[PDB]
Design a binder for this molecule. Structure first.
Ligand code: HEM
Ligand code: HEM
Ligand SMILES: Cc1cc(N)nc(C[C@H]2CNC[C@@H]2OCCNCCc2cccc(F)c2)c1
Ligand SMILES: Cc1cc(N)nc(C[C@H]2CNC[C@@H]2OCCNCCc2cccc(F)c2)c1
Ligand SMILES: C[C@H](O)[C@H](O)[C@H]1CNc2nc(N)[nH]c(=O)c2N1
Ligand SMILES: C[C@H](O)[C@H](O)[C@H]1CNc2nc(N)[nH]c(=O)c2N1
Ligand SMILES: [Zn+2]
Lengths: 411, 407
C-alpha cells in the first residue's frame, strides 16, 4: 500500500512505500492520535530474527544480497547466538547501523548529513576511566577548533542488563543548575537534579550561572565515577548582539558542541546503552529553547526590559520581539567566532531537499512534524507546509530511563 | 483505557477518559502516524440518531426518562417512514454548540457555549440564502464587537438537492492571474475568482476586492450576490511606531466566517452552515500576509525596515514577521474590532482544556493546528501534550462543489 504526502506551498506530491518496512508501534491507533505525546534482557528466541532482518538490510545496501558472504555471515551469527546468547557486530556493520539509526531518526531535522558520521568503536572499553578517555577524544575530534564534525562513540552492548555502560549526563557538555532556599534557580534549571547527584558524588561546585558539569560515567554496571572534561577541550561562545551593545552585559554564553549522551542505540537487536553522538547546533535550540523557555534560563523579560519594550500587555508582542533579537545574537556570536551553527531557515530548506531525495532513492523518509517544525516562526519555514509520515524503523535511537532511577548501588 | 497528558512546563497531568466515547477514525494506525496530513440509509441512520439523543438527554440530566424514550421512538418511526428525520430546535442548538466544542483544530473553543444559532432550515432559494447570510454578517459584526454565530440551512436529502455556499469564507479578497505571471490580490482564490467572472461578476481587479457570494439552493445552479459594503467591516493596517506602515496599502476584514464545511448532527448532514467568530492576529499577520503562496509581503516590509536581506541568518524575515503582527493587532484594537493575540488565545485554551478535563473528562486537540504559526514555544500550548480524536457532532470538510455539481 502506497501513501501520498503533499507540500501545500509547492504542490509537490511524494509516494511513501518505505513505511511498509516498519516493525515497531507508534502509540497511535485508528481511534486516537498520540503525535504530540513526548514518550508514547532479550532472549535467543527474539534475537536471531532481529539479527537476520538487519543483516539482510546491510547486505542489500552493499549489493551482496544472497551472496556466499551474506549466507556465511547469517550462519555464523546464528551459531554465535545459540552458543553465547548474543553476537558481535563486524566493524562495517556497526558503522552502517549507527548511520542508519541517525537516518531513521524521525525527530531530527539535521539528517541531510546522515552519511557523514565519524564512528568511534569503543567496544573494547572496560572502565569508567577508559570511558572518560574515549569521550575526550570524541569531543576533541568533533569540536575541531570550531569547525564541527558529526561523531558517535559506541561503548559495549548490554549483556544481561546488569552490566550496563551508561553516561549519566544527558549531554556531554551542559551547565549546572542550583536550587536556592528562596526557590529561585542559579544556572540551568533543566540540570538541577543531575547537578545534585554530582554534588552528592563529591563534585565541588563553583556555584555559578555557567559551570560546565562533570562527566558521570558507569562502566560494566559498576557505580558511576566523576571526571572533569579538560576546559581547553570545551569550546564556548560569549553571546553578544551586532547592534545592541548592552547585550554582552547580560553575561550569557553557550557551548558549541551539542552531544546527546543518554539515548540507547539499537542495531539488529543489540542494545548499546552508551552511545554519545554530536553534531552542531541550529540556532533556535539555544536562542528559543535554552534561553527563553520559562523552565530554562528564562531571559525574555530581562532582554525586553533592556529593549524598553511595552510589557504591560501581551498584544504588544514584546516577547516575540525580544525572542528574535536573542536569536540574532546567538547566530551572530557563533559566526563571528567561526563556530559551526545553522539557522532554522537554512536547516529546514535542507531538510525538505533531503526528504525529497529520500522518497526518490529510499521510498520514504519518516518524519515527526511536531519536532521538525522550529519553535519560532514556524510557518515561514518550508517544513510547516510539508505533510510528513511518522513511523519507526530500525536501526534506531531510543529513549531510556534515567540511570539513577534503575541503578543497583554496589557501594 | 485511561490516558494521561502532561504539560512539560508546569508538570500538570490530566487524565483523559473522553476518548473512549470516540466513534470516527483518525487516519493513524499502530504502525504510522498521519497527524500532519491535512486530510487524513435507514440502517445507517438510527444508531447515529440514538447515539446523539442519548448524549443530548444525558446533557439535560434526563437520560432514561419518559421524554427520552418517547423521543427515541418518535425519531425511530420518522426514520422508518421518511428515511430521514428532523431535529427539534433545542437539539439543533445543542448539536451546533457541540460540533464547535468537539473541533480539535480550534484554539478558540473556550467560547463554545456562547454561539448564536440561526435556524435557516425553512430557506428555499439562493435569494433567501443571501438574506440569511446578510443577517448573519450584521449580527456577528455588531459594529466591531463581534459575536459568534452559525446559520444552518436545510439538511441533505438525496444528495442532488444540496444547499451550498461556494465561497470558502463569506468575506474574502479576489485573486487574479496577470500578464506578468504574478498574482494581484489573494492567490488562494484565483480559482474561485475566475468562476465568479465566468458567471458574470464584473471584477474591479484590485488588490483587496471583496468577492461576491455564490450561492446554491436546493441543487440549482449557483447565483452571484454582492454583500452590502456597509455590512463588511474592514480595518486599515498601520503600525504604532512605523509611520510608513500605513502606505503599504494593506487592510483586512474583521469577520472570519468559514462557509465550506459540513455540520453532522445525529447522522444528519448540513452542507451549508456558515459560522463565524473573531480573528487571532496570526491568522492574518502570519498566514494571510506572509505565506509565500498568499500575499507574501515579507520581502517588501523588511525592505522598508532597511534590514540585512543578504543572509537568512540575520533573521530579517523573523524581524519583519513580528512587526507586521504588532501592526495587525494595533490596527484592530485602535478601531475597536475584536481580535485576540496568540499569547492570550493560547493561555485561554489551556484554561479551557483544564475546564474540559475536570468537567467532561477530556478535550480532543490537534497540536499541529493549535500551536500558533509564530513563536510556537513561547506559547503555553507548545509544551502541552494533547490527544487527538474525533467526536460527534462535528464539522467536516467536503469537496469543493465545482468539482461535483451537476449543471
Ligand atoms: C549535524 C547537525 C545536526 C543538527 C543541526 C540536528 C538537529 C536536531 C534538532 C533541532 C533536533 C530536535 C531536538 C530538540 O529540539 O529537542 C534533533 C533531534 C534528534 N537528532 Fe539531530 N541534528 C544533528 C545531528 C545529529 C546526529 C549526528 C545524530 C546522531 C547520529 C542525531 C540524532 C538525533 C536524534 C536521535 C534526535 C531525537 C532527539 C530526541 O528524541 O530527544 N542528530 N536534531
Ligand atoms: C470566537 C473566536 C474563534 C477563534 C479565535 C478561533 C480560532 C481558530 C483558529 C486559529 C483556527 C485554525 C485554522 C487555521 O489556522 O487555518 C480554527 C479552526 C477551526 N475552528 Fe475556530 N475560532 C473561533 C471561533 C470558531 C467558531 C464560532 C467555530 C464554529 C462554530 C469554530 C470552528 C472551527 C473549526 C471547525 C476549525 C477547523 C477548520 C479547518 O479544519 O480548517 N471556531 N479556529
Ligand atoms: C546531535 C544533535 C545535534 C543538535 N543540533 N541537536 C540535537 C538535539 C538535542 C540538542 N538540543 C535539544 C536536544 O536535546 C535532546 C532531546 N531531549 C529529550 C527529549 C525528550 C523526550 C521524551 C521526554 C522528555 F522529557 C524529553 C542533537
Ligand atoms: C470561525 C473561525 C474563526 C477564526 N478566527 N478562524 C477560523 C479558521 C479559518 C480562518 N483562518 C483560516 C481558517 O479557514 C478555514 C481553514 N481552511 C481549510 C484548511 C484545509 C484543510 C485541509 C485541506 C486544505 F486544503 C485546507 C474560523
Ligand atoms: C508536548 C510537545 O509534544 C512537546 O512540547 C514537544 C513539541 N515539539 C518539540 N520539538 C522539538 N524539536 N523539541 C522539543 O523538545 C519539542 N517538544
Ligand atoms: C502540512 C501541515 O499539516 C499543514 O501545513 C498545517 C499545519 N498546521 C496548521 N495549523 C493551522 N492552525 N492552520 C493550518 O493551515 C495549518 N496547516
Ligand atoms: Zn497519529
Amino acid at each position: 500500500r502506497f501513501l501520498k504526502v503533499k507540500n501545500w506551498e509547492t504542490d509537490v506530491v511524494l509516494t511513501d512505500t518505505l513505511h511498509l518496512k516498519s516493525t515497531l508501534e507508534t502509540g497511535c491507533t485508528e481511534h486516537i492520535c498520540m503525535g504530540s505525546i513526548m514518550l508514547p534482557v532479550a532472549t535467543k528466541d527474539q534475537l536471531f530474527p532481529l539479527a537476520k532482518e538487519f543483516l539482510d538490510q546491510y547486505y542489500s545496501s552493499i549489493k551482496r544480497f544472497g551472496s556466499k558472504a551474506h549466507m556465511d555471515r547469517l550462519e555464523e551469527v546464528n551459531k554465535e547466538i545459540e552458543s553465547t546468547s548474543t553476537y558481535q557486530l563486524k566493524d562495517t556493520e556497526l558503522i552502517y547501523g549507527a548511520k542508519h539509526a541517525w537516518r531513521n531518526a524521525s525527530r531530527c531535522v539535521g539528517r541531510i548529513q546522515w552519511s557523514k558520521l565519524q564512528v568511534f568503536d569503543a567496544r573494547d572499553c572496560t572502565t569508567a576511566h577508559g570511558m572518560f578517555n574515549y569521550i575526550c577524544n570524541h569531543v576533541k575530534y568533533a569540536t575541531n577548533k570550531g569547525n564541527l564534525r558529526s561523531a558517535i562513540t559506541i561503548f559495549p552492548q548490554r549483556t544481561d542488563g546488569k552490566h550496563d555502560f551508561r553516561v549519566w549526563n544527558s549531554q556531554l557538555i551542559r551547565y549546572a543548575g542550583y536550587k536556592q532556599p528562596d526557590g529561585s534557580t542559579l544556572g540551568d534549571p533543566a540540570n538541577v537534579q543531575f547537578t545534585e547527584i554530582c554534588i552528592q558524588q563529591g563534585w565541588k561546585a563553583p556555584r555559578g550561572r555557567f559551570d560546565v558539569l562533570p562527566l558521570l560515567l558507569q562502566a560494566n554496571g559498576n557505580d558511576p565515577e566523576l571526571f572533569q572534561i579538560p576546559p581547553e577541550l570545551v569550546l564556548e561562545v560569549p553571546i553578544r548582539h551586532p547592534k545592541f551593545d548592552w547585550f554582552k552585559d547580560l553575561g550569557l554564553k553557550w557551548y558549541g558542541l551539542p552531544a546527546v549522551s543518554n539515548m540507547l542505540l539499537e542495531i539488529g537487536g543489540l542494545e548499546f546503552s552508551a552511545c554519545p553522538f554530536s553534531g552542531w547546533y541550529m540556532g533556535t535550540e539555544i536562542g528559543v529553547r535554552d534561553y527563553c523557555d520559562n523552565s530554562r534560563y528564562n531571559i525574555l523579560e530581562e532582554v525586553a526590559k533592556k529593549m524598553d519594550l511595552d510589557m504591560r500587555k501581551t498584544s504588544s508582542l514584546w516577547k516575540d520581539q525580544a525572542l528574535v533579537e536573542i536569536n540574532i545574537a546567538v547566530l551572530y556570536s557563533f559566526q563571528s567566532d567561526k563556530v559551526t551553527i545553522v539557522d532554522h531557515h537554512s536547516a529546514t530548506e535542507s531538510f525538505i531537499k533531503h526528504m525529497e531525495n529520500e522518497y526518490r532513492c529510499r521510498g520514504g523518509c519518516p518524519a515527526d512534524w511536531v519536532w521538525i517544525v522550529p519553535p519560532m516562526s514556524g510557518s515561514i519555514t518550508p517544513v510547516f507546509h510539508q505533510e510528513m509520515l511518522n513511523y519507526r524503523l530500525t536501526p534506531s535511537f531510543e529513549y531510556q530511563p534515567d540511570p539513577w532511577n534503575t541503578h543497583v548501588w554496589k557501594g
